[PDB]
Amino acid sequence: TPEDVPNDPLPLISDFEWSTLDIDDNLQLDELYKLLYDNYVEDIDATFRFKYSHEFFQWALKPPGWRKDWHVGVRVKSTGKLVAFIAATPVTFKLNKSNKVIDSVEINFLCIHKKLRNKRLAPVLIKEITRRVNKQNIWQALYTGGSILPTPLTTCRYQHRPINWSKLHDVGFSHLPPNQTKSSMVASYTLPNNPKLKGLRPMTGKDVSTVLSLLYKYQERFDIVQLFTEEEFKHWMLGHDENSDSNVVKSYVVEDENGIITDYFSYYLLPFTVLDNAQHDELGIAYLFYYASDSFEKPNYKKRLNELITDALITSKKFGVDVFNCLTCQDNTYFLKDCKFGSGDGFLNYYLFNYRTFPMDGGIDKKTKEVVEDQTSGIGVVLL
Numbered sequence: 596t597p598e599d600v601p602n603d604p605l606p607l608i609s610d611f612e613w614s615t616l617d618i619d620d621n622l623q624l625d626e627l628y629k630l631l632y633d634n635y636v637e638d639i640d641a642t643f644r645f646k647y648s649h650e651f652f653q654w655a656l657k658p659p660g661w662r663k664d665w666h667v668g669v670r671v672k673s674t675g676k677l678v679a680f681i682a683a684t685p686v687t688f689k690l691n692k693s694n695k696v697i698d699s700v701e702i703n704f705l706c707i708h709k710k711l712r713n714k715r716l717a718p719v720l721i722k723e724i725t726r727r728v729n730k731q732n733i734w735q736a737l738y739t740g741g742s743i744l745p746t747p748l749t750t751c752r753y754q755h756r757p758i759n760w761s762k763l764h765d766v767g768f769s770h771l772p773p774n775q776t777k778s779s780m781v782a783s784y785t786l787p788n789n790p791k792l793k794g795l796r797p798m799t800g801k802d803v804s805t806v807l808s809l810l811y812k813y814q815e816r817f818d819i820v821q822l823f824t825e826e827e828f829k830h831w832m833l834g835h836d837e838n839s840d841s842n843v844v845k846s847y848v849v850e851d852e853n854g855i856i857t858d859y860f861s862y863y864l865l866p867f868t869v870l871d872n873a874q875h876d877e878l879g880i881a882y883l884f885y886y887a888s889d890s891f892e893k894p895n896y897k898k899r900l901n902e903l904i905t906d907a908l909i910t911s912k913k914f915g916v917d918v919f920n921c922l923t924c925q926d927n928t929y930f931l932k933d934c935k936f937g938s939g940d941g942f943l944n945y946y947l948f949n950y951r952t953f954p955m956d957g958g959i960d961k962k963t964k965e966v967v968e969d970q971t972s973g974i975g976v977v978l979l
């Protein structure tokens with residue numbers, strides 16, 4: 596190409612047709628819900644379902660600067676049924692080593708009907724969202740998932756911090772180690788009911804300006820981070836709006852005796868559903884989002900980094916969280932071990948579409964794929 600006559604054969608008719616979704620129309624947002632609730636991953640064992648919420652979608656999929664045309668779905672011509680979806684959300688990331696800002700997107704929510712796998716549909720979905728994205732002059736992309744596509748940035752591993760061990764054991768998630776005691780393990784995980792750190796309080800739209808700077812100076816230690824604007828950060832830490840508490844994302848700051856912000860952390864909530872259980876049908880879960888501390892240069896860093904995350908946990912209880920989850924990215928390996936974070940079983944792979952760059956650290960010993968204490972990781976961004 597360019598050619599007089601295309602060399603390869605042309606497409607044959609299909610039973611599916613492209614349909615851009617409108618999460619503004621509650622009727623469609625409802626379909627998206629059903630699609631994900633019925634065919635999206637979960638625990639390998641198979642007994643869990645993400646508990647999406649109308650309030651979670653507005654948060655996750657409508658960051659400032661979002662586009663509808665990036666919400667692509669595939670429906671069946673006959674019945675109209677929505678059988679696939681893939682979304683793209685605007686994000687600005689930067690490499691700290693080579694110093695470069697790259698306005699790109701975050702490919703998320705790739706989903707195909709449980710009974711439509713093995714049709715090479717997945718790939719078709721990507722090249723498409725990409726085609727649309729490439730139309731806005733963006734040429735790179737971030738995504739996480741199966742070790743399918745080659746040349747991944749790095750690999751991180753799951754970590755689970757049991758807040759309500761018992762309930763977890765009921766659902767068959769956490770297993771009781773060789774000779775111990777349900778009653779005893781419950782203590783090994785027990786935590787206070789109040790944040791140890793003083794000057795700790797929820798964040799507000801007034802702390803954005805500040806916190807963003809604190810963050811911007813903390814991430815310097817990673818090879819790839821995210822660069823938010825003021826309207827963006829607010830959204831991602833505060834929710835649709837400040838004048839109305841977000842039930843999805845929780846953020847907190849710590850002030851000193853002078854009224855200055857020295858630390859901060861955030862985390863989001865997205866529970867599970869316990870199926871064939873006669874006790875409960877909802878597992879509270881929180882994912883560690885972004886955080887920061889100006890003590891990184893100080894010598895007490897890690898000591899502080901542990902208190903900080905430990906308070907974040909004590910707060911997770913006011914929301915029904917039964918397990919606190921995070922990966923091995925960022926400087927998490929500093930607080931894992933001592934906070935009683937349990938090593939998981941799942942692995943995540945980060946990808947950067949159309950852009951070569953040195954592989955970074957995932958936080959795990961590349962050989963045993965097991966966690967490695969105090970080891971700053973290249974990955975300093977968090978994707979849902």
Ligand SMILES: Cc1c(C(=O)c2nccn2C)oc2cccc(OCCCNCc3cccnc3)c12
Nearest residue numbers: 637638643704753754755768918920921922939979
């Ligand atoms: C997934 C997940 C799980 C679990 O499945 C889990 N925890 C307790 C019991 N189970 C079965 O545990 C994690 C630990 C770290 C990061 C994680 O995931 C990080 C990525 C999260 N994506 C969530 C998401 C958001 C929007 C759409 N789909 C998925 C996870």
